[PDB]
């Protein structure tokens, strides 16, 4: 069928190398946006601005947001004095998100993930109607414009609104980056394309660490990260629309003109000449010839409820650990580098294990170790720095490996008639976990160590539900 035409037109040739590289390139800045709150919203040490004046906690530091009424307690009313030695200006220092507004920092991150969740749902449907190239162009422009306006937001509600729209646009690019590349690649390569995207996203953690080290101002950093998406919109007009979508849309005239252009780039002009309407109609016989069944059929229910738990738990604990970089005693400019560095060997071990033993034993190992490492982190006293840092790095490594393991597992358990819906609805649960993770982080005011326990007790429970899945090997 269609797979033969791509092989006939040149397979993986010059066009595929140019297009896939250009489409996947913006994924470097994807990790620089989700994690950006660690650098544009860091909390420097703040002691209350005097009108001797500042009571001290039993540790010894000046108490946060309590000052003596008369010189040697009353809450701050003249503002705060921040530490300008390592963080010049973050959104916490710009709008006093310190004591009565601790949750306002986490709420802004939660509102961003609502954009990511809403972006995939809306722009996923919009892609199937206006194409994959047109939606990608509109997402490149929206990400650049909405990201830029956040760097100039005069009010906190304006900052949240212009970051929610950035999250809405940044889900469309990630979703369409996979679709526009997979559809132009042969079927047997589809497994490799998903791996490349994850590794490309992995290198994005390094880029954020490098940029945030040289441009610490939050207004400059937010603008600088969203600046390149203007250049990703200028060259987005030269993409070649996915020919598979054109054939499915019923416009077989377009899919002949799309394939011939690929033949010219790939150099197989003569084989491109043989293409015509009549051969296209005959070859594309099975191409032109629903989530409701995912909740109705009994045998498919057991997969959806189970698989939604692994997707949710893996992402819920991933963003409950990535966003905590300041409680380790090491500079965040180094922990972020280490966090992205452990991503690669952990994924390689994950790929090595599944091919060696299976998928179910790999899934239990990936999550339970992450749940144990996170849980042990909370009990271990903060005095230990190397011990606590090692556990968190090891925990984030497993959760990175769990993402690859659960992505391949979803693509092999769901039947081919449902996979597109099952994978699409599977990743939606992942974005739901990213929303709830900051909200769970907001309860640290009720109990200092509660968020770590919830971030650890969830993957442990998920490791106790992955035993209800048929392993796929051979
Ligand atoms: C199903 C999407 C998962 N995501 C969460 C969306 C809010 S993601 O941010 O795009 C991501 C994170 C990490 C890795 C990895 O390292 O394996 C891959 C993808
Ligand atoms: Cl996503």
From Swiss-Prot:
Effect in UniProt of substituting residue 29 to A: Complete loss of PAH transport activity
Chief subcellular location: membrane
Sequence ranges on the Cytoplasmic membrane side: 1-8, 128-135, 185-195, 241-302, 355-360, 412-420
Site (Important for interaction with cidofovir and PAH): 403
CDD domains: MFS_SLC22A6_OAT1_like
Effect of residue 49 to H: Lower Vmax; increase in substrate affinity and increase in the affinity for the nucleoside phosphonate analogs cidofovir, adefovir and tenofovir
Positions bearing the site annotation: Important for interaction with cidofovir: 201
GO CC annotations, alphabetized: basal plasma membrane; basolateral plasma membrane; caveola; extracellular exosome; plasma membrane; protein-containing complex
Compartments reported by the entry: Basolateral cell membrane; Basal cell membrane
Ranges annotated as spanning the membrane: 9-29, 107-127, 136-158, 162-184, 196-216, 220-240, 303-323, 334-354, 361-381, 391-411, 421-440, 450-470
Stated consequence of mutating residue 38 to Q: Complete loss of PAH transport activity
Effect after changing residue 403 to A: Decrease in the level of membrane protein expression, 70 % loss of PAH uptake, increased affinity for cidofovir, lower Vmax for PAH, and lower Km and Vmax for cidofovir
Domain of life the protein comes from: Eukaryota
Comment on protein domains: Multiple cysteine residues are necessary for proper targeting to the plasma membrane.
Protein name, per record: Solute carrier family 22 member 6
Species: Homo sapiens
Organism phylogeny: Eukaryota, Metazoa, Chordata, Craniata, Vertebrata
Gene label: SLC22A6
